[PDB]
Amino acid sequence: SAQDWHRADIVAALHKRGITLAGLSRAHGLAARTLSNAMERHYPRAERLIAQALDMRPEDIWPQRYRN
Amino acid sequence: SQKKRSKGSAQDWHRADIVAALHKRGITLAGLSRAHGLAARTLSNAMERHYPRAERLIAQALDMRPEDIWPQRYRN
DNA sequence: CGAAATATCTATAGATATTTCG
DNA sequence: CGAAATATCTATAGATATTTCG
């Protein structure tokens, strides 16, 4: 539980709920690709929106990005 | 064998160490970007995410291989 | 099947804060 | 001093390759 989730695991968890990164981005008024940017770099707002969709805290998906 | 473990556990340079090493050579990320026809901020993007070309240009400026600055990004 | 989403490598920029330089 | 460079959080997009979905 100290390791960041793999990007494939985050995507799989969203898809199981009937949610896509693209759809979730569009639903929040962002460009389709914007939330997927959080898969490759630290982006607090995008992380918060993704975590919210999974009923999780962003620090539990990406503990290494929230060390401090 | 001993060589292979050491590759496997190598860690990425801290961004401050990369910047310090460039500056000691009289090079800035901004200057280096502009010198290659890129926007001033573009090479600094490699400090926050995997960007192979930017990594290559930065490593070249330090006389290094990008996989020695960012071993964790070049782990296959 | 084709459409859409994801993965990757490509390159970008506005606002704000801080540090370093000329 | 103001300019320039770096750091962070904000959000973006063209193209190719691959995977997943309806």
Query: What Rg do the C-alpha atoms of chain A give, in angstroms?
Result: 11
Residue whose C-alpha is closest to residue A22's, from A9, A13, A34: A34
CA–CA distance from B36 to each of A54, B45, B48, B53, B63 (Å)?
42, 15, 20, 11, 16
Token output for A3: 């390791």
Q: Which residues of the protein have their beta carbon within 7 Å of strand D? A: A 15, 25, 30-31, 33-34, 37, 42-46; B 15-16, 19, 22-23, 28-31, 40-41, 44, 47-48
Give the technique used to solve this structure: X-ray
C-beta separation of A63 from A6 below 8 A: no
| CB A54 under 7 Å to nucleic chain C | no
What gap in Å lies between CA B25 and CA B52, rounded to an integer? 22
Q: How many other C-beta atoms are found inside a 10 Å radius of the C-beta of residue B29?
A: 24
Query: How far is the C-alpha of B70 from the C-alpha of A3, rounded, in Å?
Result: 19
* DSSP summary character for residue B62: T
Q: Does A41 touch chain B (CB under 8 A)?
A: yes
Contact with chain B for residue A40, Cβ under 8 A: yes
Instruction: Work out the burial of residue B57: count CB atoms within 10 Å of its CB; fewer than 13 is exposed, 13-18 middle, 19 or more buried.
Output: buried
B36, B29 Cβ separation under 8 angstroms: no
User: CB of B69 within 8 A of CB of B55?
Assistant: yes
